[PDB]
Design a protein around this ligand. Structure first.
Ligand SMILES: Nc1ncnc2c1c(C#Cc1cnc3ccccc3c1)cn2[C@@H]1O[C@H](CSCC[C@H](N)C(=O)O)[C@@H](O)[C@H]1O
Length: 279
């Protein structure tokens, strides 16, 4: 891995500054865990996480969700979880009074009913629904996610967001405004990000040129940037994905006090890796 000296990783898609012509055990739960720890910790910093209800759609099996709860439960943050998926969840999510497990595929009619029963409590939406997928599969998925937002009207949302490839384009479509969070420990050449939005919902047109810009920017990220060793980075592992993870984890709150910031991140990573069974 070519060596590089960095002050900070790319945290959002907008920060990628170059492009290139495209050509771990249970790493997926680690990717989801970090991005949802990042998203929800940002909400905690804005003081809006607390007293909210997290509605997670497409949450199965959702092993990592157990860590997310226990984290905020041990911080004393009052959160109710509603996990809705047609597939069965990981049994490790059983027996938690503040976690509601719902076995159901969501449609417009059912989003209306859960809004009725949760209203007027703050809703935080996390969607990871997926129906390899075609561009029509994605367009329907993103349509459904817009429908989640227009009905549930969450105070914030994290949405699965991967632009359709330019050579499989169909039509321009619309997605919410928000910050496109980059995911460490994503698959080697995935172009998926998490659309993070805090609502104070204006839709944005996505064009075939955007798809080209996504494809080239994310390829440069996956081919060049993520294959670097950050030699100035004071950490047991200096591979970029760990440098990236380190900057996400420093936004996380802990009840425990640590002598240094590096000590905190090391503790959190050990905790996350141990629960996810990662050496
Ligand atoms: N509507 C929904 N509501 C809830 N969950 C849904 C869906 C859905 C769909 C659909 C669909 C497909 N064709 C249609 C055709 C016509 C009309 C309507 C149609 C709807 C998929 N999912 C779940 O998304 C997860 C992705 S992996 C998450 C992994 C998870 N993030 C983790 O922690 O591991 C899977 O578990 C999957 O079961």
């Amino acid at each position: 891995m070519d060596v590089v000296s960095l002050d900070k990783p790319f945290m959002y898609f907008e920060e990628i500054d170059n492009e290139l012509d495209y050509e771990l055990p249970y790493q997926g739960q680690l990717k989801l865990l970090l991005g949802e720890l990042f998203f929800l910790s940002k909400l905690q910093r804005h003081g809006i996480l607390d007293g909210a209800t997290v509605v997670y759609i497409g949450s199965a099996p959702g092993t990592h969700i157990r860590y997310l709860r226990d984290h905020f439960y041990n911080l004393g943050v009052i959160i109710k979880w509603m996990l809705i998926d047609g597939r069965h969840h990981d049994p490790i999510l059983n027996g938690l009074r503040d976690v509601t497990l719902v076995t159901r595929f969501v449609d417009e009619e059912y989003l209306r009913s859960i809004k009725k029963q949760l209203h007027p409590s703050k809703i935080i939406l996390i969607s990871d629904v997926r129906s390899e997928p075609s561009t029509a599969d994605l367009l329907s998925n993103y349509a459904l996610q817009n429908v989640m937002i227009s009905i549930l009207n969450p105070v914030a949302s994290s949405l699965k967001w991967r632009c359709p490839f330019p050579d499989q384009w169909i039509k321009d479509f619309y997605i919410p405004h928000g910050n496109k969070m980059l995911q460490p420990f994503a698959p080697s050449y995935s172009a998926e990000m998490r659309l993070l939005s805090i609502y104070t919902m204006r839709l944005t047109r996505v064009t075939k040129s955007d798809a080209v810009n996504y494809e080239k920017k994310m390829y440069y990220l996956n081919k060049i940037v993520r294959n670097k060793v950050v030699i100035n980075f004071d950490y047991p592992n200096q591979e970029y994905d760990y440098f990236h993870m380190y900057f996400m984890l420093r936004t996380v709150y802990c009840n425990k006090t640590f002598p240094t910031t590096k000590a905190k991140i090391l503790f959190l990573q050990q905790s996350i890796f141990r629960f996810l069974n990662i050496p």
